[PDB]
Design a protein around this ligand. Structure first.
Ligand SMILES: CCS(=O)(=O)Nc1cc(-c2cn(C)c3c(=O)[nH]ccc23)cc2c1ccn2C(C)(c1ccccn1)c1ccccn1
Length: 113
């Protein structure tokens, strides 16, 4: 069993690392509005959207019972962005960096729990 406070205290810095990255995290900070961007095929391809603000909300309200659940959600966010965008799109490169930074911070923390 984990309590909501310990999970937030343990994992929030890894999420903060992602938020720290400017301008990489900016498009990930809130959920996409595909009609606004003119990419109306987005929810055809990305079946389960995920963004930093949803992950932060779940960690703040303790909707994660287990730390794997917070880790699924981060990878869901990256896998969505890699699924939808071309390898040469600016969002692709951004997702690639945040993914890069997330590995450096997550591994030590998961061993700690
Ligand atoms: C209501 C929030 S919003 O939808 O407007 N926020 C934005 C989100 C996203 C976005 C998020 N994800 C995960 C994707 C993705 O996978 N593919 C394409 C776009 C995006 C892009 C948004 C923006 C805003 C500008 N942008 C744009 C499209 C953008 C592109 C690249 C990097 C940053 N911003 C932009 C910037 C300047 C001028 C015109 N458009």
């Amino acid at each position: 069993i984990f309590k909501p406070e310990e999970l937030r205290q343990a994992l929030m810095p890894t999420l903060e690392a992602l938020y720290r990255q400017d301008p990489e995290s900016l498009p990930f900070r809130q959920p996409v509005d595909p009609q606004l961007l003119g990419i109306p095929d987005y929810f055809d391809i990305v079946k389960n959207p995920m963004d930093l603000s949803t992950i932060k909300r779940k960690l703040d309200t303790g909707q994660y019972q287990e730390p794997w659940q917070y880790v699924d959600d981060v990878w869901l966010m990256f896998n969505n962005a890699w699924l939808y965008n071309r390898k040469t799109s600016r969002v692709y490169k951004f997702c690639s960096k945040l993914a890069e930074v997330f590995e450096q911070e997550i591994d030590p923390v998961m061993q700690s729990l």
